[PDB]
Amino acid sequence: EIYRFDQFMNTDDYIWVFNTTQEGPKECEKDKKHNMTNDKIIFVRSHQEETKIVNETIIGDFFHYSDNKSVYDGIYISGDKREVHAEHLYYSSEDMICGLVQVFARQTDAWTELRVRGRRSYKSLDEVCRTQYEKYVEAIKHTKTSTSPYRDDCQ
Ligand SMILES: [Cl-]
C-alpha cells in the first residue's frame, strides 16, 4: 500500500538504475547515501563516461507526493545535472531491495526508473516490481524506450 522513499534510501549500499525510460541515460547510474535526517538526505549520484566516474552531490527534501501526509513518497532534488526536480516512489518491495521511481525533470520531462539496492541478478528481483515495470514498458514502447544503464563491470 505504502512506499516510504525515506526508508527506501535508508541504506549504506549503492542503489543502481537497472532500467530507465529516460531518453539519454548515462551508464552506471547509482546513488550512495552520505547522511540523512528525518526530512532530508544528502547522497551522491554518479554515472560513468566510458572509464571515468562522475559524482554529483544531491540535496533531497522528502515530501508528500500523494494526499497521504503520513508517508514520505516524494523527494525534491537539487544538484542533478539532468535537471531532475522531483522523484516519486510509486512501488517498493517489502524488503525495499527493488523500487519503481517516477522522475520529473526540467519543466515537462518525466521518465521511470527501476532502482535496485545492491548488485544482484534481474531475475532475483521482486516479481511485482519486475512485472509492473515490464507491463508499463511494453505499453509505451511505440514512443518511449526502456534501456539498462547498468553493466556488471560498472565501478
Ligand atoms: Cl527523457
Side-chain angles (χ1 to χ4, degrees):
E1 61 246 60
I2 293 300
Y3 313 114
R4 292 180 192 274
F5 218 156
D6 51 317
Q7 288 319 292
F8 184 72
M9 293 195 81
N10 190 9
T11 176
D12 290 335
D13 215 339
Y14 291 99
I15 300 172
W16 301 87
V17 177
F18 265 30
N19 282 104
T20 184
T21 57
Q22 185 197 347
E23 286 197 1
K26 304 300 212 198
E27 307 95 77
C28 303
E29 295 184 322
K30 65 177 175 176
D31 292 332
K32 181 77 154 76
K33 163 187 161 186
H34 185 65
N35 82 278
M36 197 184 63
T37 68
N38 290 318
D39 315 336
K40 175 164 302 217
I41 181 157
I42 309 322
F43 61 100
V44 175
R45 174 160 287 168
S46 58
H47 65 270
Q48 284 191 194
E49 271 306 280
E50 178 160 77
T51 189
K52 50 180 172 187
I53 179 164
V54 175
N55 301 313
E56 282 156 38
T57 294
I58 311 293
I59 311 298
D61 285 289
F62 296 116
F63 74 97
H64 310 296
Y65 188 85
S66 96
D67 286 319
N68 190 325
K69 275 142 63 192
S70 293
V71 175
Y72 280 141
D73 56 336
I75 189 178
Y76 276 123
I77 297 278
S78 301
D80 191 313
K81 300 185 126 182
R82 309 170 294 177
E83 200 104 339
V84 168
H85 293 306
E87 301 180 347
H88 169 225
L89 179 70
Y90 70 92
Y91 177 83
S92 53
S93 54
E94 276 179 25
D95 58 20
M96 300 183 286
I97 286 180
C98 194
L100 305 177
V101 181
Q102 291 171 320
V103 180
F104 303 100
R106 301 212 166 268
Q107 299 294 311
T108 48
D109 287 342
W111 62 84
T112 305
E113 294 184 354
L114 173 60
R115 298 202 187 153
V116 174
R117 181 189 291 190
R119 301 193 208 232
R120 63 193 71 244
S121 78
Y122 180 83
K123 274 70 71 215
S124 76
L125 295 180
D126 180 73
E127 193 228 47
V128 167
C129 205
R130 278 186 289 115
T131 70
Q132 281 195 23
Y133 185 79
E134 284 162 9
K135 282 180 189 302
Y136 172 62
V137 161
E138 172 72 16
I140 53 150
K141 61 172 179 171
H142 297 179
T143 58
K144 197 79 154 278
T145 319
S146 156
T147 63
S148 178
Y150 180 75
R151 319 189 300 273
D152 189 65
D153 67 4
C154 286
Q155 298 169 18

